[PDB]
Structure formats: structure tokens, C-alpha cells
């Protein structure tokens, strides 16, 4: 698949375990973030002593989540779960497993 | 050019007017941000009443961006203290006609 970068939000829709999520492609971030409002209440989260330069000691998924795209590619991520975010943010942890590259005509 | 996305910071080096800057490709941002620490003191910046999710400074002028293949255009970045890296937003990336692709 191909997605030009424009003024519009670059987005991907995929599954984490059994649930569909939509998020912003976020090359700027090492790690994936799910906004607390999209986080399934029954899925366990845990404190971390990680710090995110961009929210200190954020929550993270207790378990690894199986990501799956619409072509049935899959892998594991363990996202951070952050309160008061407008959008999910797909980081380079996920993007790299989907073998996504950036290219210019030139 | 082609750059796989990996754990390493995806970076671009280019000119804004006469000066070289290096930064992180930041698809998540509408607008480009330059570290106040890298910002030439003689280049004017202005208050805004915009918030970036606050009241940040922005370049008073449009800056001519130029890459190493001599593609060019205009951006007007925000200028923010206390960031570790410059951040290339979609204002710049869209003018460079950058695509994301997967095998």
C-alpha cells in the first residue's frame, strides 16, 4: 500500500488483539500510544517508570498485543496508554514491523 | 531517496534560507518546529495566539527550504525552547512529495 504525506492526518486502521483501532502515523515517536478513551476497560495496564519526552511514568499495556493489518500481517507491540489524547499514535515500534518506508519521487 | 522506518530516528538535513538544519521526520505534526537553541538570533520571531497541543513563537518570515537535490519551497516554522531535536512536519514533508509505502 501507498500513502502520500499531505496536510491531512496520515492514518492507519488495524487490530490490536480482537479490537479495531485507527491512529495517526507518528514517525516522531519510538513507541505506540493508545488514548485512554479507546483503551478497552477489561485490558490490564500497569505503571511504568519510563519517561516520554513529548508525560512522565505513563501507563502501559500489561500484555503484549498482537497487531494485525488488513492483509493479515501481524506482530506484537506493547503500547503506552495516555489520558487526555485526541488520537492514537502509531510509533516506529509498529511502523518498523510493518516494513513501512518513506520515499520521494525525488 | 528512500528511508526505511526503523528504531533509529528518521532524519533529514536541509537548508532554511542560508543555514543548515538537521531534524526528525515528524509525520504526526502539521507544522515544522525548530529548537530556539538552533534559531539564528538575527532572524525575527513573533508571538502567536495559536496553541500546539502553548502560545509558541513562530518565524516572522517564510523561510525557503532547500534539499541536497535543490528541491525548494516555503515553510514558516514555530520556534520552541527545550526540545532535543528539530521536527520536520507535514508542511515540509508534503512539499517534498514524500510517500509512505509498504512491500
Amino acid at each position: 500500500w501507498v500513502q502520500p504525506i499531505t496536510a491531512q492526518k496520515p492514518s492507519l486502521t488495524l487490530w490490536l488483539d480482537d479490537k479495531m483501532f485507527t491512529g495517526l502515523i507518528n514517525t516522531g515517536a519510538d513507541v505506540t500510544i493508545i488514548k485512554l478513551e479507546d483503551w478497552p476497560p477489561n485490558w490490564p495496564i500497569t505503571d511504568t517508570l519510563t519517561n516520554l519526552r513529548g508525560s512522565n511514568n505513563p501507563k502501559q499495556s500489561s500484555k503484549y498485543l498482537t497487531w494485525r493489518d488488513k492483509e493479515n500481517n501481524s506482530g506484537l507491540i506493547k503500547p503506552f496508554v495516555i489520558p487526555n489524547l485526541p488520537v492514537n499514535l502509531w510509533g516506529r515500534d509498529l511502523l518498523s514491523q510493518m516494513k513501512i518506508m518513506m520515499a520521494s519521487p525525488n | 531517496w528512500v528511508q526505511p522506518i526503523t528504531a533509529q530516528k528518521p532524519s533529514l538535513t536541509l537548508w532554511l534560507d542560508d543555514k543548515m538544519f538537521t531534524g526528525l521526520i515528524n509525520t504526526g505534526a502539521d507544522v515544522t518546529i525548530i529548537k530556539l537553541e538552533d534559531w539564528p538570533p538575527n532572524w525575527p520571531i513573533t508571538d502567536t495566539l495559536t496553541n500546539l497541543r502553548n502560545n509558541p513563537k513562530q518565524s516572522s518570515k517564510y523561510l525557503t527550504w532547500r534539499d541536497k537535490e535543490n528541491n525548494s519551497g516555503l515553510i514558516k516554522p514555530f520556534v520552541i525552547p527545550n526540545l532535543p531535536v528539530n521536527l520536520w512536519g507535514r508542511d515540509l514533508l508534503s512539499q517534498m512529495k514524500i510517500m509512505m509505502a509498504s512491500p
Binding site: 492526518k9 502515523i25 516522531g28 515517536a29 513529548g54 508525560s55 485526541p86 | 497541543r53
Partner: peptide, 7 residues
Amino acid sequence: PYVFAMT
């Protein structure tokens, strides 16, 4: 404008 970086 929304600005989504972090180590």
C-alpha cells in the same frame, strides 16, 4: 496545530 516526538 497538533504536534504529536518522544524517546
